[PDB]
Amino acid sequence: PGPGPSIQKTYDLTRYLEHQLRSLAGTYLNYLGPPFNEPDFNPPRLGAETLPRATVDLEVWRSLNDKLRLTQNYEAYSHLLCYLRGLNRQAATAELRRSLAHFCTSLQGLLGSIAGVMAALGYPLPQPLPGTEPTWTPGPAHSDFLQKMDDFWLLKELQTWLWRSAKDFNRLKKKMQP
């Protein structure tokens, strides 16, 4: 099929995952924390500093050509998937864990599809060895409020990363085909 239908399927899957993540984020904010759903509750982020950020400039976003963006997106996807698995092991609720496992396996399928697309475009970089230090990330001894704040910041960063990845895929579609 080539890069024609594959990129369209990836974009549709990213849109579906964005909708599912929006629904899951609404549910998680309504469930976890009385001062979290109705109030603003924007505290300074001093607890989460290990996960990769998604703060890039416009010029450095337009300078890349379909390779560094893909590598960084793969690394961020792996890290966020590990963190989501940790959050899943942390949470304890039947329907919530079911929806979380559904989202996790859908994100894993999307990552596999992205890896297949990368291997299909003819780039001699199939799969570089990622991490292996945070490959498990066991839950350390911390407070419950700190863990809740870390989970909230992780969800926000994952939403921002999904939006940035959708915009970057749109930019790649604009730069590649026409």
Binding site: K9, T10, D12, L13, R15, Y16, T105, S106, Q108, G112
Partner: protein, 392 residues
Amino acid sequence: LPPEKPKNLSCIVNEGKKMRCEWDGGRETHLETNFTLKSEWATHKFADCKAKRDTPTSCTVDYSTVYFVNIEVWVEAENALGKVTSDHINFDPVYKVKPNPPHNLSVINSEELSSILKLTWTNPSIKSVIILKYNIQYRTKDASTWSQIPPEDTASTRSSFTVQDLKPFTEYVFRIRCMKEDGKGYWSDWSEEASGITYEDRPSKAPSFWYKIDPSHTQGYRTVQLVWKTLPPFEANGKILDYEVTLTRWKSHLQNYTVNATKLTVNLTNDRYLATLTVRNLVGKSDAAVLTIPACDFQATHPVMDLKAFPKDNMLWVEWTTPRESVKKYILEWCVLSDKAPCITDWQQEDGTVHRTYLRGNLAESKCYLITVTPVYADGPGSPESIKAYLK
């Protein structure tokens, strides 16, 4: 016995719900026929399945249905005489999506436009993933056959749709099913039949009218019995509220009535008159007719000749010849003749250019019918002509 691997490689996918993949059973094996189904995403293998002992035709495929992924499934045959697999098939679950029929269908009247009828519905949760094409079917509540709307008009996803060029005052029912835009995929079920009426669309047809020449006796003023038939439902386009007539008399003089009932009693004199009617719908007045009554000393004025009547197929038929100059309107009446039984005068309207037209009623056989045909001219009618004819 040989394993008799399954075939036909055909099954559907549901919108997030549990999906079962169907396969053919085959022939009578009866040797621990318990198949298994596999799944593969080329990066991760899902858990295998097990064919049901009751109906080993379909089982679970994937608990969490994911779209836009390459799923490889194959049904393996396992028995005592070795093992064998079947043909492999690669399909996309997004192509075999079976959506839900749109619910809450409702039609409304916007601004009394009798030409366009809008319809709205709610699209399912799959509208954000696949493009849906629509095929609306409508029909009359009386008819049993359906009418299909051209599919090329609703080939794209739309929230509302308006059907144009409909019939006035006839109830329609609607049901809609959707599928993928391209066409590769299974259809959906039929939605709930939604009712709905059309607009008013006042009738642009002049109703019938006929008077009487009853022999009044009060030395002058004549009591004429104005009788007109009831307008048919399709020819009326709405509930008949009331009838309005108009009487013509000497210069600068005219009267009219608005009686609810379909019967009027207006006096006459020794001068020429002209009576017109006009039915009023909910929006306004309809078209009128024409009729003159010079019953003072009028002559036959070339009455119609050559009157023959023979049913000859399952119903009575009337035929005559064309008069000398021309004819404007045609009208004929009939009733049942028997031993001391009053018969009512039932009639109908016919065009002038037509000379043969079968009657429409509920007459029976083995009875004497006196069909009387009376012509209509510009200066009064002609003398009546009666003829007897049986049915069977």
